[PDB]
Symmetry: D3
Subunit: 289 residues, 6 copies
């Protein structure tokens, strides 16, 4: 099958990889600009020469993967595609027009899916001719094997089974989700990080104490403060506000301490500082000390 992947950003690249990894699957990596298409494609090229050179990929397998992936922009490429997985800018009117255009571009049998974490799958596919489903990947999508199959108000049960079967065609475990804010993982995980920021804000414990408590007591792989610096605190803060706005419940109000840090650019690793300082010399120190 042929798969069109809208958006050549970090999530788009990882989704292109997840399909190119298998077999006869072809990936049309479209974006706004062919420059931005091949940009993401050169990024896919770079990594996939590395795990060659570290005895982790043969080469005639690393090459056949970038070979199934053809970049470019849509319109050109998505007419024959079997499935669209859009991974563009988490913006309602973007996704709506993008899907309106592809609605006349793609063949009638193409399945429409979006990777959105924070927008209504149902609202995205309102005035359309074909069902719109949610196919939620987890970065890096080419390694992580969970798929949340988001069902919308009008998404037929068959459109769901098809995605679950495709997911099981590329190596993932699909979990069915009837549309609600934060689905399952975000709705549970992000408020974990929020609670940790409230615990630090109220002088209950320190940054490093909270994280070693959470990983030696719940045997988690990371502390929640660590984890949020790794997700990006602007991601965390945005998820909290979606939950809060979708529910009307103060239970999901964001820690003011997260909204302060994000206002200051202290977003975590990607900005060198959030709850920890990632030193130009590689290691990790809590801003407590």
């Amino acid at each position: 099958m042929k798969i069109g992947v809208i958006g050549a950003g970090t999530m788009g690249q990882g989704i292109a990889k997840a399909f190119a990894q298998v077999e006869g699957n072809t990936v049309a990596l479209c974006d706004i600009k062919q420059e931005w298409a091949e940009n993401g494609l050169a990024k896919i090229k770079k990594g996939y020469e590395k795990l060659v050179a570290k005895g982790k990929i043969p080469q005639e397998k690393a090459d056949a993967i970038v070979a199934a992936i053809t970049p470019g922009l849509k319109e050109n490429l998505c007419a024959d595609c079997d499935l669209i997985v859009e991974a563009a800018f988490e913006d309602m009117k973007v996704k709506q027009t993008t899907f309106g255009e592809l609605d006349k571009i793609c063949k009638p049998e193409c399945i429409f899916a979006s990777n959105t974490s924070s927008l209504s799958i149902t609202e995205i596919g309102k005035g359309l001719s074909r069902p719109l489903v949610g196919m939620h990947f987890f970065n890096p999508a080419d390694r992580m094997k969970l798929i949340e199959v988001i069902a919308g108000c009008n998404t037929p049960a068959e459109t769901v089974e098809k995605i679950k079967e495709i997911s099981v065609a590329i190596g993932k475990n699909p979990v069915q989700v009837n549309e609600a804010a934060g689905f399952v993982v975000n709705r549970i995980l992000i408020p974990m990080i929020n609670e940790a920021a409230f615990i630090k804000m109220e002088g209950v414990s320190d940054i490093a104490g909270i994280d070693t408590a959470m990983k030696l007591g719940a045997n988690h792989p990371m502390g929640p403060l660590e984890l949020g610096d790794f997700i990006g605190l602007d991601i965390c803060l945005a998820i909290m506000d979606v939950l809060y706005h979708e529910t009307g419940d103060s239970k999901y109000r964001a820690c003011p301490l997260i909204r302060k840090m994000v206002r200051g650019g202290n977003l975590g690793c990607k900005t060198g500082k959030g709850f920890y300082v990632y030193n130009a010399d590689r290691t990790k120190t809590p801003v407590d000390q």
Copy 2:
């Protein structure tokens, strides 16, 4: 050093083991009737009998462990204990009373600690003539490496470090906590579970779906529902209620579904049913199907 452990239930066994796995650590495992204490030791001798039969521990240390835990009842035992770790029934006047009795019994230098998870360390030692501090273990205490050190309103810093030093001396990391509901672990962990039951209850995903989504989407060792069954859905409901009463915050309201199930005696593993049925075949079925 000598350690008196009040309560021969599951926690006092685990705590008595964590001490007795080391060196000059003698233990006095006490309960309300000596019979019940001699019971607790019998279950200790029991596993330690298997661990030797699995080559996993020499007998020569496993016997020197049990030989250092002496069963009996306080008055007759904790008189020269250097430290008291109370782990009895989660009731206020029970703990104000046994600590009040222990204030006359034990020598002026013995430290008073409580393993409570749901009561105020500050209120448990209101009448005492010495400080009272929290020493929060996690079952199984002998295997779990975390101890939350809880300073009450009047716990001196010198006592708090004497708990940090004792915890390093038995292989554990002390996190210091200023007394607040849930400390760190439970305040983050049990609202995870509570959100998982809300998700099931609001028809978002299924029990098996939620659990595999949290261990794949976030790499948690267990699913939240699976985890509730294993801590005890009565513990979870209680911890949630303590949070809601201590703070007055609707955020920590407990999912009516967990109360529905605790009222039904469906508390998880220890009652054969919970979010999963623990079928006699030693497998595990989600009660969705």
Copy 3:
């Protein structure tokens, strides 16, 4: 079938007539003392003698209905009973002890049912040898057709339908409720009254205009304030506190104005005064003027 109705107050009387109006049904009207049983049996006959007047039921049938209901208490009367509908004091460990006594008394096939509106079905049938179900009648039980069948956490499916069958056997429409505070009608009806009381207390409109507006703008049979006086303002207040405590949600916080009135004994109709003064001369005046 033979039915045992526990409690001889307004509801137990009404439930007995609901069953004795039928056919091969006979009722055991029990309470604490036999004087208290046949007391409610006395009211039932006199009510039927009033019906024999009017032209509404012949004295042949009025006698036939009453010859089915036997006064007395359990222990003597409820051993071959097939169904037990309880309607006693809205208090948990009474219903638990009352059902605990009937556990030995009633025969093993006898379904245990409760009419409770505010207690957890699940909790009452906790210790019991046999399941517990909700059979929620609506005053007056002999005329109102609605029955909410409440499933508890452990109510088997077959029990729920043995109760939907019987409800049709006496001319009711069963609606299945999966236990949750206030089930369906109260959880909607009672917060209607409560919001009406806030409208008065926050000065939005007067008492007659709030009631006029709702039966004119919504074609409702009564206005919420009138309805609150008719139900009993102490019933409405207890129900709101149940909704609020079961959910921990301030959405169901009771209007202080209703609590003020219940504290002053102004409970509605049964005390001659609530939101309206019920003049002993038949008429109804709002305490606004």
Copy 4:
């Protein structure tokens, strides 16, 4: 008197009917352009061309009613008007522009009233030369007999009574409301529907079981979910969010299921599906089976 109604939709139509059914009442229907106004007058004509032919009204009147209604648009007809009843588009600043235009068009002693449900009466007529009062009709305006008179912060008691006076002059009962979100009826009626959605979403019972529980246990003329579809789920959703935003109280938080259904265009009767499917053969099947 002569009344200027602005807006020729469902409300404008019914509002002018209620005025033109009386006596010396002449009405100036207006809208954006007269193609829009003559439009509404024509729908008024058709319904009146059926209420005669069924035998229920004679033509003489059903001719003189439409005779007193003159279609068109403002500026040329609502100068000598006495009472303005705006019913245009539920958006603030156009209402502010609309009223400020008539501020100079109309004669000074002309009363300004608005029919708004979700907008501040006080805010609409801020900078105006003259008071602005609420005159909340209920669809259909020609027969529903309730009218809510909305007092704003600066709405003199005199303007309010001259609105009650006019209201008893056309058969309706006026209820004075002092401004607050949802007045009396929506604030009580729409959270009803909101709670019924929660009862469905939370698995408490099914769609048809909810609606028949509230029409048998409470003698309501329709079920809450029925009524939801009848009102328009988009309208219900909008009111629930005016209450929340105006109060800041999570008590009026919209049920996320209502919102999901609205995002998919499933609004109820006017789209053929909300909680029921409105079969094109005049039946009604709940979307539950």
Copy 5:
């Protein structure tokens, strides 16, 4: 007039003084037993000679005041009093019975007033056969000019005016409150101190800087933390928990930092430590340092 004051603790002695200060007023200080009723009166004498000793009262007037106050227990002295002011334990069943005993003892025209700030005036006079009204004083009662006349549900307006007249007659300014939790002063003043504890608990600023910011910013006499130490943090916590329970609104949830200090006996000025440690050498240090 003759005044019966029920209770000889801090408040009773304060109300007795505030009456006997006038002239033709005699007070009947009654409490549990006479040496407790005789305890206050000596306490009262102590101050008043100091009041002469520092020529702030002649002895002429400091002895005529102690002369007007006759101790002993009720029943003996209250058969003829014009006004009764209960100042006993803030316990509902005590209040109800002492007033109930008083209902036969006092004469038909004796007014019943209570000084309670935390209990329902409506409920306290529920059974009684004459109006119950609130007369709320502020410690110390003899110098503080404000009285809050609490009208209960069934408290007649005539009873409010005579309470208002008496107040003006003893040199107070009365403010009419229709019963609601915290009346007016506590409802405003105590959430201030609660907010100040949150600021400190959340790291916003230190204990001294908050208190100097509120007196230098709002020109307040004392800082909210200072003031809480003065009132007694056990008192401030009790008002919050009453506000929270009466209203059901988490808006009145008590700072957990206040419950921690109270559980530890750090109540403020009356224990030597609160937000400030009070040095026996007359100064005051924030626990921040």
Copy 6:
């Protein structure tokens, strides 16, 4: 030192005089127009010329303060300044750009401060080359002695000291605040006013009774309703909404009464009506009567 004040409005002049009152302090008062700037200085002269002829301050000192305030626009004037106090429109991008321009103009050592009460100090300096700090004055700035020093997420401790030191050197008392909504004064003070309006609205007391119960009961200089009119109710409504929005906590929901009143132009003293009508003949009357 030299100080550039940005904004010639009521807050900018106070800040100009507070610095120029001292000595070697010189001041640059800048605005959008220079006819806007020396408008603010000319009023400074007018004010100082009124206190000259009250015999309260001598001319030669009035002259000496005015002679150190040079008006005009930035760009020209603030190039050599050593402190920047921004007091312009409370408008997020206005400041972000105004501060962006200044960052080029001023020397590398000029400290940057904003007198903003409701905006984030961290966001205002999101991408500047230098740190940005809070310097919160109180109208009237030249007379009020409190300054809250506001540290944003990235504000260096030393920068916070330079503001503490400068504050002490111009006579003020600096309270350090780690940026949170409402700082200390407002976050405490404005919810008082807010709660006062909820008492009025819920019919608990009346406007003048509340305002006297606070200044007699708590020995406050003004009542909360009075203070509200004095600050401006639009400001109060605006601070209440920042808190609600910054926390997601309904604790800080604005009273609907105040929203109705601001939506009504009734803002207090500055519109001649709010909770009191500020009559033209100097006196003040509660709108209650």
